[PDB]
Design an enzyme around this catalytic site. Structure first.
Site, PDB file in Angstrom:
ATOM      1  N   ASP A 242      37.046 -27.334  17.899  1.00 19.98           N
ATOM      2  CA  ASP A 242      37.342 -28.639  17.358  1.00 19.98           C
ATOM      3  C   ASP A 242      38.588 -28.703  16.505  1.00 19.98           C
ATOM      4  OD1 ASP A 242      35.167 -31.169  15.980  1.00 19.98           O
ATOM      5  OD2 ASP A 242      37.299 -31.269  16.317  1.00 19.98           O
TER       6      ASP A 242
ATOM      7  N   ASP B 107      33.321 -31.296   5.752  1.00 24.30           N
ATOM      8  CA  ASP B 107      32.542 -31.251   6.996  1.00 24.30           C
ATOM      9  C   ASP B 107      31.071 -31.579   6.804  1.00 24.30           C
ATOM     10  OD1 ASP B 107      34.531 -28.527   7.565  1.00 24.30           O
ATOM     11  OD2 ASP B 107      34.415 -30.098   9.089  1.00 24.30           O
TER      12      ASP B 107
ATOM     13  N   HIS C 222       0.809  -1.238   0.000  1.00 17.15           N
ATOM     14  CA  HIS C 222       0.000   0.000   0.000  1.00 17.15           C
ATOM     15  C   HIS C 222       0.837   1.280   0.000  1.00 17.15           C
ATOM     16  CE1 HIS C 222      -2.070  -3.275   2.139  1.00 17.15           C
ATOM     17  NE2 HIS C 222      -3.124  -2.923   1.424  1.00 17.15           N
TER      18      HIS C 222
HETATM   19  C1  LIG Z   1      43.857 -25.453  11.036  1.00 24.72           C
HETATM   20  C2  LIG Z   1      42.944 -25.311  10.011  1.00 24.72           C
HETATM   21  C3  LIG Z   1      41.593 -25.322  10.286  1.00 24.72           C
HETATM   22  C4  LIG Z   1      41.156 -25.455  11.575  1.00 24.72           C
HETATM   23  C5  LIG Z   1      42.066 -25.563  12.596  1.00 24.72           C
HETATM   24  C6  LIG Z   1      43.432 -25.569  12.339  1.00 24.72           C
HETATM   25  C7  LIG Z   1      41.607 -25.729  13.860  1.00 24.72           C
HETATM   26  C8  LIG Z   1      40.267 -25.733  14.133  1.00 24.72           C
HETATM   27  C9  LIG Z   1      39.362 -25.602  13.118  1.00 24.72           C
HETATM   28  C10 LIG Z   1      38.014 -25.605  13.386  1.00 24.72           C
HETATM   29  C11 LIG Z   1      37.130 -25.471  12.351  1.00 24.72           C
HETATM   30  C12 LIG Z   1      37.569 -25.329  11.052  1.00 24.72           C
HETATM   31  C13 LIG Z   1      38.921 -25.328  10.794  1.00 24.72           C
HETATM   32  C14 LIG Z   1      39.810 -25.455  11.839  1.00 24.72           C
HETATM   33  S1  FES Z   2       1.799  -0.454   3.131  1.00 25.10           S
HETATM   34 FE1  FES Z   2       0.287  -2.013   3.609  1.00 25.10          FE
HETATM   35  S2  FES Z   2       1.473  -3.853   4.089  1.00 25.10           S
HETATM   36 FE2  FES Z   2       2.954  -2.207   3.798  1.00 25.10          FE
HETATM   37 FE   LIG Z   3      36.189 -28.947   9.500  1.00 26.77          FE
END
Ligand SMILES: c1ccc2c(c1)ccc1ccccc12
Ligand code: FES
Ligand SMILES: [Fe+3]
Ligand SMILES: c1ccc2c(c1)ccc1ccccc12
Ligand SMILES: c1ccc2c(c1)ccc1ccccc12
Ligand code: FES
Ligand code: FES
Ligand SMILES: [Fe+3]
Ligand SMILES: [Fe+3]
Lengths: 446, 192, 446, 192, 192, 446
Positions: F205, F362, F104
């Site tokens: 991790d 992953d 609107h």
């Molecule tokens: C080297 C490369 C990637 C990672 C790490 C170290 C260490 C943790 C990690 C965690 C998630 C994604 C990549 C990593």
């Molecule tokens: S002007 Fe009416 S829904 Fe946005």
């Molecule tokens: Fe990973």
């Protein structure tokens, strides 16, 4: 919904609320009271014959690894890593001494034990109690003539007792024939039906065959071809129906050893089965030898079905209330010639596999009946299974179980749904047993 | 292709590619395209008898497999690798055609709608049998029915075609290794 | 959520909680309190004129078969077999004396009766009470000048009373024109919007037209083309808005008989409508003859909408809170030349059908407004419908209903949502009536 | 085709197939492929004015129908079998093109993305009108917009093309019987 | 094309279409079709080393972009319009190929299944560089894995190919502007 | 489920119920207790540098407009019209003084104010209180060195305090480097994982890297290549892990300034980072200068993650329990040469973008671990995060936070899940604070 009180299945199994095929809360409840409690088909010896052989299988919505141990037993484990829960095995079958997780590399044995952890000494030292970190094991794994079933509930009856009166009908083909093999791999197809729709159909539904399968009957010229389009009703004494305490049931169509197979297989099969029958007369008696070469349409409660002689073997794997993953194997007699086994396996898939022209006839029936269970005006409506009620017997001198001495009826539906209702309204096996102490009396009322 | 170096390539696939890289005959590719387009047209309009008569040889093997998922490193487990979704001779195809045409095939009312898309056509004559034509093509197959059901199939087809009655080229082998292990199309009741 | 207590619509219909367009629990509740309770559009006489003619239709999420009986009446039945619940009819329209189930072959008459069961004598004997196994019948089926509506609730008001003050506005076109025909088959398209989004838009929303439809207005050169891009506001006295007790409402745009149709149809239409108006002056008076040839944007509560003169006829069939299946028919005056009827039907679909370029302008508005009702920070936010509040009247000497005497406002939204809230918070028609005993007073407050 | 034997085949479909099985002109098939590929390119880049100018004849009928689902055995119910999703003359196509190009077409911002896949091209000259070219082709049409909206359309097109201004072949009829009865693509606001 | 009149058309798209409307060489279109069909076959069977060796030039730029959604009327905001999903030289493609072939690429077991559909092929020689071949084509790419994972990709490809070692035509540039802004295929780890 | 009482995360964060990755009711609860309560990443100054510049962003499942005001501040508003709830802005970025609704035509300023209503005088007169109809504003918007975060909860701690002990580790790269820029636009890809799966992976991790990324490590020849296939464990003292009160945490891998970048970038990067480190020694001390050029894998609670030096910047936007929309940007140091910035941005997307070959490693881990949380036998199972427990410290003289002085462990998981459980079981920030008054003591138990 209060499952202790809700009448989902009426007395004597005469009717069921249509919502049972559609209600997702009930589906979740069945995971607990049906699938986590009862015996479920896993595999056959023929598919994992050697130490280290494994397959994956569903048990309800869970996935398990089923492995032949070095001692010749079979153990099954959840397909889930004990560390951070990743799926361990991504294939369907193989041979291995163990399974390594692709996330952090934990290694589990074929026996489920946590055998190795990368850099354990440097990272965990002596702190990790690997003895307590084995894969979650399926409590019970038992065999019926090579057919391997599992059950998550330690309290379940032995598989033989669970088969109840159905075992007597299966044994001529499963035992006295010399044994069966399962020919894999299975076909796998998702249908938009509740698992109970095909389960009830195979347990008990001879009535649908002439009409549903009119085109397949007319086109294949199989031995049951006379039924096409309800052109003819089978003769009096053409068969019987049976059911049992724990829900398994089947129809018996006398002498139909070639089953759904087209005229290309009829003569060889009818010769082969008749020859074996002649030998079995002397071993198990005429009636049971005849049962061997009679077409059995059976459901082993809850979700494993088969057509003996046709050799169709099915698992109706549940996904949600209107989704089922259908697994289709062929069963063959081990002492059949190898060329016949091959042709029979192809014919099973031709008729009832992913492009099975017979199975295709059932799709809309199963799918729409299931989906209608979600529709507002149908939820509280009653699905009828009263055909033959007041004519069933129990304790017959020749044929055991609750038996309808007619080829077409709904005896086996009533037994299937009686068991279903008893489980859904019970918290454990003891309660099911209490709810089933007059099971046959309930089914044979007038 | 060296499959020891190209580690992901199967011996079968390497053999099939050798077939087309070698003598390219532009006119043969065009003939193959026409044959397949006409076949697909007949199938799409559900002229299944015309398909058998005009497109399918008496000695046909019409085969669609589903292969079990196994480890890439697997070398010990040696049981049946695949099942036959289709493995049909002419007679068996005729049974399936009669099933489609039967007026009590309830699933065919209301009438289904098919639309096929054929691409990537390659053609080569067999070296040893100078009357055998190898044709490779890919298909997308769309099946619509019952208001809101829509199923789409995807496959590569390895065909052999040979001249039969009246000198008409007809299908004597079709092989499909279906790429999806678990079908999400209700069934595979379509002629790929 | 407690629907007895929850204020989903504020007093006087001035605002609504945004969650009403997204909440799936509320959707399920509407199946009961909206769709199972109220009158829903089925078909037109013109689509099932002869004995045996039938169509399928949705009523809420349920599907029904709507059949012309031999006596010339129309009856409607759930499209669900009374045996094991399979969908009976898989086509949209046809002619038949009955319907046979593809599962086990039960045959039902056009009158819903179970007429035949295969092999009844041999299987059921005399045991099957077929008189009790007729298809589940829609309790109420009534016609408004050939337009057939159904209601599952026996307690509903007659359809004429349910239309309330809206009937007076519809009658010049629906009755006094000589009658309308519905041109089928409808277009059918799924949109990712709640059913209420298009329902509220058609009931009451003239404000959006210049801006939402700027491109369609500029491109078609229809009679309302001056509004494009809010370049001009309609003159004073260009129209009015109305609403009614049971929720139906509409806008009236004086004299716009060619409606959305492009310049290719404008002259013929403006001639045709003006000629009929001249005749109607003498029969129904000048004001009502003018209403005949004035553009009405109407919703017949809950989910049937139309644009008279444009000839657009819509059903917003609910699927879930953010899914609606849109059915689009054309309405034509029976005494129009056949060639004009054909061109008008094509133009309806050109503008508002599946590839309707006007309808396409509304997609994102409807879809996003609906989907935003699921978003956490918007659930409890207030959708505003206060434009014109404190200027509506009731009981006017010329124009009945709760009326806003201006072409653009939100009068009809307020009446639609007042009725909606009264149903959602009520268990039956008696309770709705109690909740609506001061309906017009609530709507005309200051 | 004998439609008394091939029970699933419509008279219309049998007529259309007769058109292409008879004189195969390889060069005409190539011309047709070029024409359709160029048309699809213009449409994909949203050159709608260029499409009208270069591809569409002044006497065009551009028609897409949706057919009501009826019983395969139905023989009594004889009311309008189909509705027109499109049934456009040149003027009506121009209105739709101006609608697409209007800067207050809010649904076109951010800009849509189209990708068309044209396959199964067949071409034959009309027997009676030696200047009328029949072209059949199938289209997959992918429309992406607004981050995560994806709609895919599938159809067979029965076209007639004829030489117009400057000897350029232009579309004088397109007919599509859309295969899905209930659309699951939000709308059919695409030029098939 | 006049992009002041055809308001939805980008300058880039108008330039590319000019390239193919001008000299049509039927034989070149056929050569291009063969090249692309063979490339797609190699990729579909996961012969990634063979693809590099036979199809990819040492000086290649292999680029797939994702463009940010901006207002059709936008004229002030001038920051990076797109990101590179791929923008690879030969070395970088080789890294990706080694990654695919590595036996510890756990995601490749069980083996993936690819099926590619190449359509709408257009080819033109470059005006200034008489050894540079412009090829445009569209691809549907189906990837199936792990029982029930199915991902389908849709794209138009603007390629330049040039004769290299042994006179073999090889890819020296591929450009794809991916049509879907938010991917619904888990990743774009496929060679379009 | 009763979130006040349910133990979803065990004491000390040692384990979590697997259902947390699958349960949709819990997902809905997280919308309230996680996403509506905590600080969420919106954008960077570099993406909206000039007055009028805006972007859209998700905050949980809500969408907001984030706009540079004329005074140089940034304000954020729900992307939802205050009239009937339509989504206001359909693009991702732009420059404008305001936003007009396509339904609107209501016009809102860049400051959220309702500035114009079409035909206001003629329609609403003086009745519309536009001052009360501004877009719903995000209560809190704060910057951390150009990185802009928002929070719907006025009661939240300031963003700096919320970062807690994590801020000390980020500042060398975010502040002392001269500042970072975010290179847009982001890649955007949906994965079938719970948002917590990648969030926990990036927070904590390092254990997975050698095994999960074996192929990417082997193939890229990045600086961490020695880890491929668990061929080598990093040396003693190769890094540390940390966590904080409000849930943010990271790993530190000493000296890894080239991160995941392939050998093509390693020399230039290692030169650039080392040169800056030499300058920073004098300004912030040797340890913090070394942290600048050390690889940090961090999650800023709940759902923003990064890899410094690699330059990967992620938002895990929640859709449902098993669906997450992944946004991937590149971060670069502002004083890098422009050509290096370009190459680094492409390399970030090459490795971790939509076709990122590392990120692809992953997918199955994240997806299957999440989906297994829905499976019946896994819901109540325990995901383990005990590696390193009993060796963490708090209050160290050099490294702040709860710290594990080893490169590989699960310290940061424990802190992430401790904070998560405290929020899920709390109704507001005061309750979270009460539940967290002994946070570090809980984490350092033995
Ligand atoms: C080297 C490369 C990637 C990672 C790490 C170290 C260490 C943790 C990690 C965690 C998630 C994604 C990549 C990593
Ligand atoms: S002007 Fe009416 S829904 Fe946005
Ligand atoms: Fe990973
Ligand atoms: C399910 C499927 C097939 C059958 C039955 C049940 C029951 C009887 C029967 C008899 C012949 C052939 C097939 C069948
Ligand atoms: C919904 C759809 C169209 C309209 C309206 C409501 C309301 C008024 C109106 C007026 C002209 C044309 C179309 C309309
Ligand atoms: S999830 Fe299996 S090793 Fe970590
Ligand atoms: S379900 Fe209809 S006859 Fe059985
Ligand atoms: Fe059946
Ligand atoms: Fe509108």
């Amino acid at each position: 919904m209060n499952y202790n009180n809700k009448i989902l299945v009426s007395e004597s199994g005469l009717s069921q609320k249509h919502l049972i095929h559609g209600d997702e809360e009930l589906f979740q409840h069945e995971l607990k009271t049906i699938f986590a409690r009862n015996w479920l088909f896993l595999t056959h010896d023929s598919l994992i014959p050697a130490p280290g052989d494994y397959v994956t299988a569903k048990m309800g919505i869970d996935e398990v690894i089923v492995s032949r141990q070095n001692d010749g037993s079979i153990r099954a484990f959840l397909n889930v890593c004990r560390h951070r829960g990743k799926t361990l095995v991504s294939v369907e079958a193989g041979n291995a001494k163990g399974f390594v997780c692709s996330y952090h590399g934990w290694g589990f044995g074929s026996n489920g034990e946590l055998q190795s952890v990368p850099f354990e000494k440097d990272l965990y030292g002596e702190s990790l109690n690997k003895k307590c970190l084995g894969l979650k094991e399926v409590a019970r794994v038992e065999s019926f003539h090579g057919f391997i079933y599992g059950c998550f509930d330690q309290e379940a009856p032995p598989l033989m007792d669970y088969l109840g009166d159905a075992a007597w009908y299966l044994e001529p083909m499963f035992k006295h024939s010399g044994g069966l093999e399962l020919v894999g791999p299975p076909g796998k197809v998702v249908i938009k039906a509740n698992w109970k729709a095909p389960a009830e159909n195979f347990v008990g539904d001879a009535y649908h065959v002439g009409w549903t399968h009119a085109s397949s009957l007319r086109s294949g010229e199989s031995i049951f071809s006379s039924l096409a389009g309800n052109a003819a009703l089978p003769p009096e004494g053409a068969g019987l129906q049976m059911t049992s305490k724990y829900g398994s049931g089947m129809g018996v169509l006398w002498d139909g050893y070639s089953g759904v197979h087209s005229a290309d297989l009829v003569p060889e099969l009818m010769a082969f089965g008749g020859a074996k029958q002649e030998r079995l007369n002397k071993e198990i008696g005429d009636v049971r030898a005849r049962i061997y070469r009679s077409h059995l349409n059976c459901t082993v409660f809850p979700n494993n079905s088969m057509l003996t002689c046709s050799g169709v073997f099915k698992v109706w794997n549940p996904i949600d209330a209107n989704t089922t993953e259908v697994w289709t194997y062929a069963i063959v007699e081990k002492d059949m010639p190898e060329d016949l086994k091959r042709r029979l396996a192809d014919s099973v898939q031709r008729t009832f596999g992913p492009a099975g022209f017979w199975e295709s006839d059932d799709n809309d029936n199963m799918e729409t009946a299931s989906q209608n269970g979600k529709k507002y005006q149908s939820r509280d409506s009653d699905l009828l299974s009263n055909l033959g009620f007041g004519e069933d017997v129990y304790g017959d001198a020749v044929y055991p179980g609750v038996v309808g001495k007619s080829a077409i009826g709904e005896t086996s539906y009533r037994g299937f749904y009686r068991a279903y209702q008893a489980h859904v309204s019970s918290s454990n096996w003891a309660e099911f047993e209490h709810a089933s102490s007059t099971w046959h009396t309930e089914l044979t009322k007038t | 292709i060296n499959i020891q170096e190209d580690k992901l390539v199967s011996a079968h696939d390497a053999e099939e590619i050798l077939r087309f890289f070698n003598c390219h005959d532009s006119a043969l590719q065009q003939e193959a395209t026409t044959l397949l387009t006409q076949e697909a047209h007949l199938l799409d309009i559900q002229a299944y008898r015309a398909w058998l008569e005009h497109c399918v040889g008496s000695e046909v093997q019409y085969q669609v497999i589903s292969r079990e998922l196994r480890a890439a490193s697997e070398r010990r487990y040696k049981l049946n690798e695949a099942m036959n979704v289709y493995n049909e001779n002419f007679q068996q195809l005729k049974v399936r055609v009669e099933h489609q045409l039967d007026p009590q095939n309830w699933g065919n009312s209301p009438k289904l709608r098919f639309t096929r898309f054929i691409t990537n056509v390659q053609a080569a004559m067999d070296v040893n049998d100078k009357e055998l034509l190898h044709i490779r093509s890919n298909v997308i197959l769309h099946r619509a029915r019952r208001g809101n059901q829509v199923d789409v199939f995807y496959a590569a087809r390895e065909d052999k075609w040979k001249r039969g009655e009246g000198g008409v080229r007809k299908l004597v082998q079709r092989f499909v290794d279906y790429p999806e292990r678990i079908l999400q199309t209700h069934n595979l009741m379509v002629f790929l």
